[PDB]
Design a protein around this ligand. Structure first.
Ligand SMILES: [Mn+2]
Ligand SMILES: [Mn+2]
Ligand SMILES: [Mn+2]
Ligand SMILES: [Mn+2]
Ligand SMILES: [Mn+2]
Ligand SMILES: [Mn+2]
Ligand code: NA
Length: 325
DNA sequence: CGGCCTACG
DNA sequence: CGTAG
DNA sequence: GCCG
């Protein structure tokens, strides 16, 4: 089992769901306490289990697996023996964990803001609504729309949103294209948001495109919130006899950068962190959603496809549905 | 032990 | 500070 | 928390 998540297929559904979920609780808790290192180890350990071909049934089977040390092994051992891990359950029921989860899941609120509010004694969403002068416009939007934004986005929703984005993009720039990215490109049937990547086959014609797209969506009454290359929107999505708010991310890239942007925006988040770490540490190349840089020759790698990028990193190709690290 | 991805709004 | 995968 |  290779050490980096980008070196192994990780399907969306797998054989160790309960074990991975418990490790991901500890990862999330570590993030709420500012320990990105412990978050990463717990996330990586969970991801290893997702990549296994069958269920872990005995502690012996963790021997030699990367990212399983004393702590993560004990979590698995307790779940195997008792069906529950006291540490995990203590985290789950803790006021700190529940409140940090509630606050950080608000659009506009990160760990730093949630932590400050927690120390000020705030605990509920209505606590935040009582003092709205303290909130950013982004946070006010996240709070007004919080209920809808907590409701799963379905594939049928995604198809409807893609049609309206394509209509605005078509008027903004004939020939421009719209590609579904994020979790839905990896095969998820539901999600909490929708991600799109926009380009044009003629290099440079995409310049200035996102304002024109946003102006046209706004004029159609579809934008409940927006604040360029990346637009983090709340869309009004028609529903039977009503509508609901949906988070949509719109991203523009020139066609030269499109394979890097597609790779980056298809994720998963952990997969891309691991891929960038592998690139730099194992191959000495610097990767982001714009390109891949050789800092010795001081040159950028030209890519026409995601397959190109995997080849330039010496990695076997993984389709999106196997990037669910 | 140091590192832990790397951007944009 | 927030956002993104 | 774990790896190199
Ligand atoms: Mn420990
Ligand atoms: Mn026991
Ligand atoms: Mn997404
Ligand atoms: Mn998104
Ligand atoms: Mn750019
Ligand atoms: Mn150290
Ligand atoms: Na948030």
């Amino acid at each position: 089992m290779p050490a980096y998540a980008c070196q192994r297929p990780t399907p969306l559904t797998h054989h160790n769901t309960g074990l991975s979920e418990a490790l991901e609780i500890l990862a999330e808790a570590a993030g709420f306490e500012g320990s990105e290192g412990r978050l990463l180890t717990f996330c990586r350990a969970a991801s290893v289990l997702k990549a296994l071909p069958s269920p872990v049934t005995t502690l012996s089977q963790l021997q030699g697996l990367p990212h399983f040390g004393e702590h993560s092994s004990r979590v698995v051992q307790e779940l195997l023996e008792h069906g529950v891990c006291e540490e995990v359950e203590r985290v789950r029921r803790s006021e700190r964990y529940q409140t940090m989860k509630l606050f950080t899941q608000i659009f506009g609120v990160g760990v730093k803001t949630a932590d400050r509010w927690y120390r000020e004694g705030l605990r509920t969403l209505d606590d935040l609504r009582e003092q709205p002068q303290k909130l950013t416009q982004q946070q006010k939007a996240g709070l007004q729309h919080h209920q809808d934004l907590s409701t799963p986005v379905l594939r049928s929703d995604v198809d409807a949103l893609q049609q309206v984005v394509e209509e605005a993009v078509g008027q903004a720039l004939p020939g421009a294209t719209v590609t579904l990215t994020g979790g839905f490109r990896r095969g998820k049937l539901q999600g909490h948001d929708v991600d799109f990547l926009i380009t044009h086959p003629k290099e440079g014609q995409e310049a200035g495109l996102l304002p024109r797209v946003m102006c046209r969506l706004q004029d159609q009454g579809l934008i409940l919130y927006h604040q360029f290359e990346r637009s983090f929107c709340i869309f009004r999505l028609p529903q039977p006899g009503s509508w609901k708010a949906v988070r949509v991310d719109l991203v523009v890239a020139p066609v030269s950068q499109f394979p890097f942007a597609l790779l980056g925006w298809t994720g998963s988040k952990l997969f891309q962190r691991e891929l960038r770490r592998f690139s730099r540490k194992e191959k000495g190349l610097w990767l982001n959603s714009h390109g891949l840089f050789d800092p010795e020759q001081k040159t950028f790698f030209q890519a026409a496809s995601e397959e190109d990028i995997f080849r330039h990193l010496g990695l076997e190709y993984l389709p999106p549905e196997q990037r669910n690290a």
